[PDB]
Chains A and B, each alone.
Chain A
Amino acid sequence: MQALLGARAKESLDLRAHLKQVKKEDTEKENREVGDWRKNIDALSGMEGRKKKFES
């Protein structure tokens, strides 16, 4: 009498687990573009004088 509710609840879980496993495998396999970068600055602390350009 319960054989089908077991089987039906399982079919739903197996499909949901499949679909989530597919997106999770890519989420976990590669993760660099999903991260961040230093984005550093210039400051010009070595600028002890004027440049060679006529504009400086």
Chain B
Amino acid sequence: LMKILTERGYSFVTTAEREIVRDIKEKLCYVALDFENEMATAASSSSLEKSYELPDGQVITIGNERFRCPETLFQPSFIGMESAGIHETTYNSIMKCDIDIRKDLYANNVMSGGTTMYPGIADRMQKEITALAPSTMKIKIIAPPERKYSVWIGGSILASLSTFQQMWITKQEYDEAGPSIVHRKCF
């Protein structure tokens, strides 16, 4: 996003500028369920632009840059990565599991982490897998408001489970073994 905003006349190269672009992205960007058609109009008219107030009183608007940024999730080649996107990797993780597993993973595609908060991501990912998946199978995405905070929440859940109280390394075992103990006791 910083490089394409530079293309539009908004060059952000220092730390304050970088932190600001991240904030702009979080509030203005979306994935688009059809990149090329969305771009055809975003690149042609101000009607698909959204404004942002910069901290110094200046303003910026974002056009196709608004969706080209998250598009890298579907097209990693945008940043120089040799990859077909997060939906191909999701597809392969389902496909590479045993044949009696595949049906359950297709129906339980879980979005987690941040960036899951770009509008349309929960739906585009179901579309992209459905397009690769066999027919008959149900493809479904799980995308709760507990998105981006799901790892922390999982930590809270796990730390407090009765089924997890035997998984903790105590500060006894730790000193006898040293920190390498984590590879035997945790994961």
Give chain A nearest CB distance to B149 CB in angstroms.
Answer: 14
Cβ of A55 within 8 Å of any chain B Cβ, yes or no, is yes
Return the CB mask of B154-187 against A: 1 if under 8 Å, else 0.
Answer: 0011001100000000000000000000000000
| B158 closest partner in A (C-beta) | A54
Tell me which residues across on chain B come within 8 A of A54, comparing CB atoms: 156-157, 160-161
Task: Say whether chain A's binding surface is mostly helix, strand, loop, or mixed.
Answer: loop
List residues of A (31-56) whose CB comes within 8 Å of B's CBs: 54-55
Chain A contact residues (Cβ within 8 angstroms of B): what range?
under 10
A54-B153 Cα distance, complex, nearest whole Å: 9
Tell me which residues across on chain A come within 8 A of B161, comparing CB atoms: 54
Give chain B nearest CB distance to A54 CB in angstroms.
Answer: 4
Give chain B nearest CB distance to A52 CB in angstroms.
Answer: 12
Tell me which residues across on chain B come within 8 A of A55, comparing CB atoms: 157
A55-B156 Cα distance, complex, nearest whole Å: 10
Tell me which residues across on chain A come within 8 A of B156, comparing CB atoms: 54
Give chain A nearest CB distance to B166 CB in angstroms.
Answer: 18
Tell me which residues across on chain A come within 8 A of B157, comparing CB atoms: 54-55
Return the CB mask of B15-57 against A: 1 if under 8 Å, else 0.
Answer: 0000000000000000000000000000000000000000000
| A55 closest partner in B (C-beta) | B157
Tell me which residues across on chain A come within 8 A of B160, comparing CB atoms: 54
Give chain A nearest CB distance to B157 CB in angstroms.
Answer: 4
| B159 closest partner in A (C-beta) | A54
Give chain A nearest CB distance to B164 CB in angstroms.
Answer: 11
A47-B134 Cα distance, complex, nearest whole Å: 32
| B157 closest partner in A (C-beta) | A54
A54-B162 Cα distance, complex, nearest whole Å: 12
A55-B155 Cα distance, complex, nearest whole Å: 11
| B153 closest partner in A (C-beta) | A54
A55-B161 Cα distance, complex, nearest whole Å: 10
A55-B157 Cα distance, complex, nearest whole Å: 6
Give chain B nearest CB distance to A49 CB in angstroms.
Answer: 15
A20-B63 Cα distance, complex, nearest whole Å: 85
Q: Which residues of B contact A (CB under 8 A)?
A: 156-157, 160-161
Query: Please, could you name 5 A-B residue pairs with CB atoms under 8 Å apart, sorted by A?
Result: A54-B156, A54-B157, A54-B160, A54-B161, A55-B157
Q: Lowest 3 CB-CB distances: which A-B pairs, in order? A: A54-B157, A55-B157, A54-B160
Q: Which residues of A contact B (CB under 8 A)?
A: 54-55
